[PDB]
Enzyme design. Structure first.
Site, PDB file in Angstrom:
ATOM      1  CB  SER A 259      49.430  67.107  54.168  1.00  0.00           C
ATOM      2  OG  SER A 259      50.137  65.906  54.017  1.00  0.00           O
TER       3      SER A 259
ATOM      4  CD  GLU B 248      53.821  64.434  51.241  1.00  0.00           C
ATOM      5  OE1 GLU B 248      52.986  64.719  51.512  1.00  0.00           O
ATOM      6  OE2 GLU B 248      54.533  63.612  52.076  1.00  0.00           O
TER       7      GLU B 248
END
EC number: 3.5.2.6
Length: 265
Positions: free
Chosen positions: A42, A140
């Site tokens: 992230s 993601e």
């Protein structure tokens, strides 16, 4: 020297630890495993907001995006609450940085356009800042799951730190966009136990975290000393040996950031 400590910590927590703090006029340059590849996870969410910012006007922050329940695929605490109303581009920036919202990251990539749903356009953006090493290949949540040894979706401490330095302390963005980025990283809610936990409280700390499989836990930060001198801190780790479902040890990053604080004191 100090690289004795870092392998003392590696030995202790079962990790591969990578650190890089760029050299400043007044200090050396801390490097441990500095040019080995670690997964973005992230941490990419921060240069992504800068990418959108860089190539769009500030009015673009008011454009409203709508999405489905089918679009919600990863950890997304904010996107599930507005599935009916939609979120603006600007709200997705806030959500992607301060809560690590996985779904706002996928949506903001798609706003960069291009092949493979914005991953080509994104790496292309890092290249404009001089970074020829990092690369984003997936979205993601798969960008968190690449096997150890695969070069897909990987950066290095050296590489991500020099990018971050240009984005917060440098000229990569004009000030009005620059202060939007810094404020979001400054009110982040996910890194309270990582780099922030290792520096004394009168040091000001902005950061953006990453977590994934194989015990992967990262934190990239910009810090200010009690007298106002800024440094950039890159800290990454995995635990490949323990297997795919290995647990991440955040106290490992908190301690290695204390070690950095000592040399900068």
């Amino acid at each position: 020297d100090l690289a004795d400590r870092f392998a003392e910590l590696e030995r202790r927590y079962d990790a591969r630890l990578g650190v890089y703090v760029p050299a400043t006029g007044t200090t050396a340059a801390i490097e441990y495993r500095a040019d080995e590849r670690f997964a973005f996870c992230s941490t990419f969410k921060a240069p992504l907001v800068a990418a959108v910012l860089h190539q769009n006007p500030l009015t673009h922050l008011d454009k409203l995006i709508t999405y489905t329940s089918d679009d919600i695929r990863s950890i997304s605490p904010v996107a599930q609450q507005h599935v009916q109303t939609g979120m603006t581009i600007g709200q997705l920036c806030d959500a992607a940085i301060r809560y690590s919202d996985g779904t706002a990251a996928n949506l903001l990539l798609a706003d960069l356009g291009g092949p493979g749903g914005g991953t080509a356009a994104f790496t292309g953006y890092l290249r404009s800042l001089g970074d020829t090493v990092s690369r984003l290949d997936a979205e993601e949540p798969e960008l968190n799951r690449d096997p150890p040894g695969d070069e897909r979706d990987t950066t290095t401490p050296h590489a991500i730190a020099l990018v971050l330095q240009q984005l917060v302390l440098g000229n990569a963005l004009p000030p009005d966009k620059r202060a939007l980025l810094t404020d979001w990283m400054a009110r982040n809610t996910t890194g309270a136990k990582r780099i922030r936990a290792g520096f004394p409280a009168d040091w000001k700390v902005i950061d953006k975290t990453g977590t994934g499989d194989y015990g992967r836990a990262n934190d990239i930060a910009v810090v200010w000393s009690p007298t106002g001198v800024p440094y950039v801190v890159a800290v990454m780790s995995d635990r490949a040996g323990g297997g795919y479902d290995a647990e991440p040890r955040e106290a490992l990053l908190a301690e290695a950031a204390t070690c950095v604080a000592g040399v900068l004191a």
